[PDB]
Amino acid sequence: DLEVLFQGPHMAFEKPLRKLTFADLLQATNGFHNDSLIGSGGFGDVYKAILKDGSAVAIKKLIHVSGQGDREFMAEMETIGKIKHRNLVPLLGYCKVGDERLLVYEFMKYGSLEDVLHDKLNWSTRRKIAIGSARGLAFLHHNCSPHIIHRDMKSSNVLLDENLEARVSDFGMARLMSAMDTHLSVSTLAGTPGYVPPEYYQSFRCSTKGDVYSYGVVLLELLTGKRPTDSPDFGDNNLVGWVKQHAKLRISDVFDPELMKEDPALEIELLQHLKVAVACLDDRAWRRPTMVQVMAMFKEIQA
């Protein structure tokens, strides 16, 4: 059953990035007030707000370091700033004045997957989330030239909009890799504990298969309902480690009680989705599927 993978908005007809006034963002957030904050500390603070036109936005205010360039601002502007797809967060505008660098996303109703999955998601709903987030990443790797390597896929960087559909976000660490290359050399260790592929700890090189590892983790989170690290059941392990040792024993215990409880006849489909996740988490990068294959695994499971 023949599927055309990418058929999202044609850029040429898209609303261009609006350059915004700092004063407007300043006012709309009440002087960047604390009760407007929705995200704190990581490379900036993110504030919920409604613009002059009624549009609900999230405004990321990037922290300016003395004697430094705006690398993270540019990373988003040169990547998510240039593309649109239903499984990517919409970057609506930006503010660049003096040393201020702000990024204005369309506001995604339910905030991040992490926020939701821990503090209502049924299977059908979670299935849709894994699929859409796979499509978003696939777009970055396969439908962009040069390719985009996200470098920080995690459940907090998967937003959920009105109809609970997945939107990959936070492009601050993203990098462009020529299609002729297989990897990009980076200067430092970047990524979130729980999600870093093994090879990133051996060599300062990122690649699309790097992103694919991190995706696998996000999929575990959906299947298990666990955080990627620091859960009491884990012990000396992470989510990845835990699922690994745990499975020789009783595989289906790994699954989230809430999904199992909803229906005992989805225990098989759940198991099949775990195969995808495990493939993505292969220690050998070359053996991991591309995100295009992951999507194909998903749609095979259904039929």
């Binding site: 690994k244 499975a247 020789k248 595989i251 289906s252 225990e267 098989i268 198991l271 099949q272 775990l274 195969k275 495990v278 493939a279 988490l281 292969d282 220690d283």
Partner: peptide, 16 residues
Amino acid sequence: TMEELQAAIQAAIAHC
């Protein structure tokens, strides 16, 4: 390890 795990999961669907 991983492929052992993959086998385990295949048993599980079969062992349903």
